[PDB]
Design a protein around this nucleic acid. Structure first.
Ligand SMILES: [K+]
Ligand SMILES: [Mg+2]
Ligand SMILES: [Mg+2]
Ligand SMILES: [Mg+2]
Ligand SMILES: [Mg+2]
Ligand SMILES: [Mg+2]
Ligand SMILES: [Mg+2]
Ligand SMILES: [Mg+2]
Ligand SMILES: [Mg+2]
Ligand SMILES: [Mg+2]
Ligand SMILES: [Mg+2]
Ligand SMILES: [Mg+2]
Ligand SMILES: [Mg+2]
Ligand SMILES: [Mg+2]
Lengths: 136, 172, 191, 197
RNA sequence: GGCCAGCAUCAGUUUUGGUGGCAGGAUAAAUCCAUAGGAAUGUAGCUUGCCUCGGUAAGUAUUAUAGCCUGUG
RNA sequence: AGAACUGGCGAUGCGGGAUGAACCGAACGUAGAGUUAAGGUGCCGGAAUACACGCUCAUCAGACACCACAAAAGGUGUUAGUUCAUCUAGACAGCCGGACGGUGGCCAUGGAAGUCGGAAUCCGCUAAGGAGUGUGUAACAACUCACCGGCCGAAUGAACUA
RNA sequence: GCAGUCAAGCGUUCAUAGCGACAUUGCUUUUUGAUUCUUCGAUGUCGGCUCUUCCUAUCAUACCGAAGCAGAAUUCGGUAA
RNA sequence: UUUGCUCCACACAAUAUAGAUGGAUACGAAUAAGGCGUCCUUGUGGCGUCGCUGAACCAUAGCAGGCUAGCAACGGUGCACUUGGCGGAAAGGCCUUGGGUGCUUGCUGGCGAAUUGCAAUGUCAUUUUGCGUGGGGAUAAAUCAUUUGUAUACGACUUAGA
């Protein structure tokens, strides 16, 4: 009886939208859209992570699902204050996306002895998991 | 010609015994380096006053940095350019954080839309539009609306590897 | 210019439900169900308040934003078809030879038969598209009426009937014989 | 890094896919292309049909059996692009071409193998939205390919069988994921997570 | 003895990284801090009309329960 | 086809222009290493399916000088501009109402009343009406538009430039 | 040789149904010239007969648009070899 | 047929390799949308979650992986078998039943390794063929010559002949 229309939720280019830099001097740090210059350009600020206030191409960043309240054009001090108040860093670190990034960094940081230990532990866990699967 | 810097260039029309201390003419030149800046200064000075580089001298050249390079501004740019069949004055509007970025955008846009090379363009004036509703171009007006939001549909991620195993998605 | 956002509104009356998957629209109303595939336009649908659907184009050029209003008109015509219906009345026009229009069946296909058009011995057959109902109207001389949910199918049937009766090898300013759409409106009166 | 790479050609921008395949073949990689009838060409279907008719009118005047051969099948059209971009008259190019197989649909040997895509050749990733494009199967049928319908029938049958296979695999994967969700609060799982696994 | 190599320490040529200390500019411009003055894509408050929680639409209000701009230091 | 200055080919390989006496780069003993020139870097093919801002969709697209062709004239295709206009004291478009009187204004014509033609280019009522924008009449009569209105409510129109 | 653009005029009225002055932009290489690059230790020099193929600037046939297309006839034009 | 032919198994020989050196690891569809999990009123449904690449998943320790002693658990895996089903697009593969036997690094022990000398691919794969030894299996044609004329320059074709 009621109309059904699929939402198709997009992440929005907006003031307060949190982005992740994928290329440049930041290369993996979070910033906030201070304001929108053009359809392809935004002024961003990353004071908590160390990203300098800069006009950046939208193709140089990835929009995150994280947004916090921020007035348009807010200077670096205001951006840092609102960022801390909204606890953007904790919200990001809780996401599986950041968890995947940290996991791949840890795997890259593993040494040869740690890889051997990973193999041994994986075999130990696999034994129990296969036993449970057979019991099921 | 490259990523642009703005220079103040002050030239003298070299003094003589009859006329010491000439009138010290200054301009703001957008150029990628000081050599090009001085060349352009002498080009425009030869367009304006009876003087040439041989009969004058550059008193000073100073790079002018943006006062607020991290404040988003709307710029009105008045240019004069040569097309294939004539000369035309044009006014355009560019949103950016600095005069040099706005001028680079202006040169890119003029090359893209009018095939006007650097040699064919004169920057008559660049001035920040301080007040909204003095912006008279729609392609800048539409970015001045309150609480401006827009999605980025059809995100195309670049693959690092030749082959993918996932049949990727363009969600954003 | 690449306008940032362009939007159109689609009012949904009380008896109508619009189911919009990715770009497949199913409009259901008192008169039936209409379905349309719009995967060729790249628009975005959003339900606002169960009586209003917004259709939007983001970062769209001139042709894209024109197709946006085209989409809005198409969905509006779907809703109109399921609420009021669409009916086209065509008149038979002839100077000497009376045009004989009937409904016949050929393996259960419901053709419209045109005989004696300009005295032709050829018999013209126009299949009736599914969902279109043909009625030969009384109280008006030489009127055929095509009724249905889809304005597209109704108007295409009327157009086929009109085009099958085109005059050849004659000054069509003088030989005005044919079957011409005289009225296009809705099945329900004054809705 | 596979001994054989199977590319599902659906929606794959025949020229860009062919460039990828030519480079892989010349570098020594065995490539098997399936579903060539679902390859895409940018531009209107009428544009590409006119282009194929321009190709068709070219033939050796004194003997048409000598002239350029106009293969109609989608796999052979993709092969024509690939051969035009491989140095096929040399022994190295010939060996590269023997390193390649192109199929309409997905025949028995490869229907049970993994299919990959080439993102730099994918139509949805490359073409601007709204740009018109052609389907190789439709173009081939319009220019004389005779086996669109039988390929479609066999593809429907293969898709039914593959859907049954994937339903079974999804049930088994749900079971396995349930079993791995348990023993994730185990000490071994804790050490693995500390090490990043 | 001859043939083919490996390593180390050097020499000539060169290629590609990591890192330290200085100099200059508007003794960078910025950020930041302080301060003065403002308007708005007008924040809090206040006023008017609405009603399905409770907000909304229009006014007034220049920092207040957001901020921003310019000048100066 | 004939002169001037220079550089070249002849007499000259090499890299580039696919190919080519003359063009670009560079002139050459036999080798090694490095860097380049002109030219290039999807694949052929060595080298970024590089980055960035735009523009273009062509049922004959276009794709690097010499060089292997295209013009005048056009196009609410699309883009960006110039100048002048209308507009919340209601812009344009859309539907409906009016569109008079003096007046068949004067004259040429067999007849011509606003409307085959010349001149005169006026006002009263006027929100408004032209001695007339068209259709129609043998001339009439009659529809039609300029012009003004009723309804909706914010941007719109014209001539140009490339 | 063929094709455009402008539009003073023709076309009873009406520039563009069909035409179209004064001008002007082109295309073609089935004219004839211009040139002398190839061939003078030799490319058999007219035309016809025969036979194949190609082009389209389409005479006819197919389907159409326009007319100063009532019909008939005809004219202009489009896709089309 | 001067013991022929063929299939299998092993052994020994040659023969080369467009180029193995952990695993080609299987939905379909869409991309201005989807995958998965869950729930119900089973839908173009609600809810939750994921992506932002395979940077994965599986595998992976032991004289190139030896010989042995246990513990825990009835798992994992190899093998020859075996039960049944499915697969014709090029099926030549997929799934499955039961038992036997080997290994298990799931955990804890004991012994061995050296001298290839400071590296040398330091030889581990698959591709054909030959030959020998064992076992199983089968026991023809075609061409020439002759003949036919539905054929024909000659070849070829098309007929016939114990
Ligand atoms: K001669
Ligand atoms: Mg006729
Ligand atoms: Mg055939
Ligand atoms: Mg050295
Ligand atoms: Mg000469
Ligand atoms: Mg000589
Ligand atoms: Mg030379
Ligand atoms: Mg060339
Ligand atoms: Mg040398
Ligand atoms: Mg290469
Ligand atoms: Mg032109
Ligand atoms: Mg001879
Ligand atoms: Mg001869
Ligand atoms: Mg033609």
């Amino acid at each position: 009886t009621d109309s059904i229309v699929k939402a198709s939720n997009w992440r929005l280019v907006e003031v307060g939208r949190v982005v992740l830099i994928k290329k440049g001097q930041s290369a993996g740090k979070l910033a906030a859209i201070v304001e929108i210059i053009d359809q392809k350009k935004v002024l961003i600020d990353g004071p908590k992570a160390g990203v300098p206030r800069q006009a950046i191409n939208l193709g140089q960043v990835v929009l995150t699902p994280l947004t916090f309240a921020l007035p348009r054009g807010a200077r670096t001090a205001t951006v840092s204050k609102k960022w801390a108040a909204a606890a953007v860093c904790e919200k990001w670190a809780a996401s599986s996306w950041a968890k995947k990034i940290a996991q791949r960094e840890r795997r890259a940081a593993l040494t040869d002895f740690e890889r051997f230990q990973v193999m041994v532990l994986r075999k130990q866990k696999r034994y129990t998991v296969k036993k449970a699967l057979a019991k099921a | 010609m490259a990523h642009f810097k703005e220079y103040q260039v002050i030239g003298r029309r070299l003094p003589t015994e009859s006329v010491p201390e000439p009138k010290l003419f200054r301009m703001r030149i957008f150029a990628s380096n000081e050599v090009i800046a001085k060349s352009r200064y002498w080009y425009f000075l030869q367009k304006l006053h009876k003087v040439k580089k041989a009969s004058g001298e550059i008193v000073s050249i100073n790079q002018i940095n943006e006062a607020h390079p991290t404040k988003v501004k709307n710029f009105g740019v008045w240019v004069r350019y040569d097309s294939r069949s004539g000369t035309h004055n044009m006014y355009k509007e560019i949103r950016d954080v600095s005069r040099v970025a706005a001028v680079e955008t202006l040169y890119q846009d003029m090359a893209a839309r009018h095939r006007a090379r650097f040699r064919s363009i004169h920057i008559l004036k660049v001035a920040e539009i301080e007040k909204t509703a003095d912006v008279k171009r729609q392609y800048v007006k539409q970015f001045l609306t309150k609480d401006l939001k827009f999605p980025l549909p059809h995100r195309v991620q670049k693959s690092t590897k030749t082959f993918s195993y996932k049949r990727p998605s363009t969600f954003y | 210019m690449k306008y940032i956002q362009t939007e159109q509104q689609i009012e949904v009356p009380e008896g109508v439900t619009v189911s919009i998957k990715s770009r497949i629209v199913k409009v259901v109303g008192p008169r039936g169900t209409l379905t349309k595939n719009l995967k060729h336009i790249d628009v975005t649908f959003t339900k606002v308040n169960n009586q209003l659907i917004k259709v939007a184009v983001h970062n769209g050029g001139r042709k894209h934003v024109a197709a946006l209003r085209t989409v809005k008109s198409l969905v509006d015509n779907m809703i109109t078809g399921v609420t009021k219906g669409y009916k086209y009345k065509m008149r038979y026009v002839y100077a000497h030879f009376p045009i004989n229009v009937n409904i016949v069946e050929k393996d259960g296909a419901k053709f419209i038969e045109v005989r004696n058009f300009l005295g032709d011995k050829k018999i013209r057959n126009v299949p009736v598209r599914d969902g279109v109902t043909i009625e030969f109207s009384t109280n008006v001389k030489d009127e055929i009426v095509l009724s249905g949910n889809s304005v597209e199918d109704v108007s295409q049937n009327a157009a086929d009937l009109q085009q099958i009766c085109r005059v050849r090898n004659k000054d069509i300013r003088k030989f005005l014989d044919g079957i011409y759409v005289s009225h296009k409106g809705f099945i329900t009166e004054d809705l | 890094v596979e001994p054989v790479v199977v590319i599902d050609g659906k929606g794959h921008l025949v020229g860009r896919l062919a460039s990828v395949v030519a480079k892989q073949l010349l570098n020594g990689q065995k490539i098997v292309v399936v579903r060539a009838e679902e390859l895409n060409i940018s531009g209107e279907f009428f544009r590409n049909k006119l282009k194929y008719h321009d190709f068709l009118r070219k033939a050796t005047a004194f003997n048409k059996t000598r002239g350029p051969f106009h293969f109609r099948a989608p796999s052979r059209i993709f092969y024509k692009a690939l051969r035009g971009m491989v140095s096929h008259k040399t022994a190295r190019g010939k060996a590269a071409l023997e390193r390649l197989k192109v199929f309409e649909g997905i025949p028995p040997p490869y229907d049970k193998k993994k299919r990959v895509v080439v993102p730099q050749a994918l139509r949805v990733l490359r073409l601007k939205p709204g740009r018109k494009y052609t389907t190789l199967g439709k173009l081939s049928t319009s220019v004389g390919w005779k086996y669109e319908d039988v390929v479609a029938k066999l593809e429907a049958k293969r898709k039914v069988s593959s859907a049954e296979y994937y339903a079974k695999k999804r049930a088994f994967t749900k079971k396995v994921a349930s079993a791995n969700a348990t023993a994730a609060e185990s000490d071994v799982a804790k050490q693995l997570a500390a090490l990043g696994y």
